[PDB]
């Protein structure tokens, strides 16, 4: 299909079109990407991702069209620790994408250690909300919590300072305009606090024609829950 759209105002337990990878699962009408104990508290060493089952037609070589897409979603992070880790990310990757071996912790379940910073060995575009930046382990991160745009590497092509707020929902709107090739990110907390970051990228040189979209999260030594509360997505092929 040239156009596809779906909306999850909430996430009931009875799901049919989501691919669950790792420790991800539904709990209390929301997706808990990372593992939580019986009391619902976050635990260390956990990675989880979800993908919508239907494949998205991102671009089409034969007709030189590229999709205009928008992803709106909200999530919340919570942890009794002063340094909850590691973060959640919305991503786009080839349809057969699975959790790489050893992609836990700061790698957000998106990259393998050996090529995490090798832009030539990956095919992934992601928007990360990174809460852990210890300069000794996450050497690639700026020294503060941030929102980052990742293109084939855990070392963001761009970051903006972000404030982590325990237990508060962050609403995010990610859009891509094929005409300008601008990938825009707008995130807001309920009090009006706003964050914006943009980056020009030709998705055709990074991703295959058909892709799957979803979210990924992970916790290494430090932990926190990564709760996806809602998600709506839409994409349509346009001439360029």
Ligand X SMILES: OC[C@H]1O[C@H](O[C@@H]2[C@H](O)[C@@H](O)O[C@H](CO)[C@H]2O)[C@@H](O)[C@@H](O)[C@@H]1O
Ligand Y SMILES: OC[C@H]1O[C@H](OC[C@H]2O[C@H](OC[C@H]3O[C@@H](O)[C@@H](O)[C@@H](O)[C@@H]3O)[C@@H](O)[C@@H](O[C@H]3O[C@H](CO)[C@@H](O)[C@H](O)[C@@H]3O)[C@@H]2O)[C@@H](O)[C@@H](O)[C@@H]1O
Nearer to Ca ion, 45 or 234 (CB): 45
**Residue 184, contacted partner among ligand Y, a second copy, Ca ion, none, CB below 5-8 A by kind:** none
d(CA 217, CA 71): 17
β-strand pairing of 65-78 with 3-8: unpaired
Q: Is the peptide bond before 86 cis (omega within 30 degrees of 0)?
A: yes
Nearer to a second copy (CB atom), residue 144 or residue 210: 210
Q: What sign results for the dihedral spanned by CA atoms 176, 110, 120, 136?
A: positive
Name the minimum Å distance from CB 137 to ligand X: 3
Task: Please report, as residue ranges, which positions from 213 to 232 form the binding site for ligand Y (by CB under 6 A).
Answer: 219-222
Find the Cα–Cα–Cα–Cα dihedral 205, 208, 214, 220, rounded to 10°.
-70
Pick the piece of the chain touching Ca ion (CB under 5 A) from 50-58, 60-68, 127-135, 188-196: 127-135
130 in a known ligand binding site:
yes
Mark 135-174 with x for binding to ligand X (rule: CB under 6 A) and - for no binding.
-xxx------------------------------------
Choose the one of a second copy, Mn ion, ligand Y, none that binds residue 137, judging by a C-beta under 5 to 8 angstroms depending on kind. ligand Y
220 contacts ligand X (rule: CB under 6 A): yes
Residue 208 CB burial class (10 angstroms; 0-12, 13-18, ≥19):
middle
User: Tokens at residue 151, please?
Assistant: 């293109």
Sole residue written with tokens 């040189």: 205
- Shortest Å distance, C-beta 136 to ligand Y: 5
Q: What SS3 class is residue 128?
A: strand
State the Cα–Cα distance between residues 210 and 94, nearest whole angstrom: 7
CA–CA separation, 226 and 202 (whole Å): 30
When binding is defined by CB under 6 A, the residue of 18, 19, 112, 134 that contacts ligand Y is 134
Hey, what are 70's tokens? 């928008």
Q: What mask of x and - would describe binding to ligand X in positions 81 to 120, judged by CB under 6 A?
A: ----xx-----------------xxx--------------
Distance separating alpha carbons of residues 211 and 114, to the nearest angstrom: 24
- Which residues sit in the known binding site for Mn(2+)? 128, 130, 132, 141, 146
Known binding residues for Ca(2+) are: 128, 130, 132, 138, 141, 146
**Which chain residues interact with ligand Y by CB under 6 A?**
83, 85-86, 104-106, 132, 134, 136-138, 219-222
Q: Binding site: which residues?
A: 128, 130, 132, 138, 141, 146
């Amino acid at each position: 299909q040239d156009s596809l759209s779906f909306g999850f105002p909430t996430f009931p337990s009875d799901q049919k079109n989501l691919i669950f990878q790792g420790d991800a699962q539904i709990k209390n009408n929301a997706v808990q990407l990372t593992k939580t104990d019986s009391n619902g508290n976050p635990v260390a060493s956990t990675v989880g991702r979800i993908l919508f089952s239907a494949q998205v037609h991102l671009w089409e070589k034969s007709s030189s069209r590229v999709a205009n897409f928008q992803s709106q979603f909200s999530f919340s992070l919570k942890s009794p620790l002063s340094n909850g880790a590691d973060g959640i990310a919305f991503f786009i990757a080839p349809p057969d994408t699975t959790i790489p071996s050893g992609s836990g912790g700061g790698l957000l379940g998106l990259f393998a250690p050996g090529t995490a910073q090798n832009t030539s060995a990956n095919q992934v575009i992601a928007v990360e909300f990174d809460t852990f930046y210890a300069q000794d382990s996450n050497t690639w991160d700026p020294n503060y919590p941030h929102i980052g745009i990742d293109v084939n590497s855990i070392r963001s092509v761009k970051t903006v300072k972000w404030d982590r707020r325990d237990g508060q929902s962050l609403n995010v709107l990610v859009t891509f305009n094929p005409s300008t090739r601008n990938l825009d990110v707008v995130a807001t907390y309920s009090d009006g606090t706003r964050y914006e970051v943009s980056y020009e990228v030709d998705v055709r040189s990074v991703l295959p024609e058909w892709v799957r979209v979803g979210f990924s999260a992970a916790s290494g030594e430090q932990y926190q829950t990564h709760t996806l509360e809602s998600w709506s997505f839409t994409s349509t092929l346009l001439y360029t």
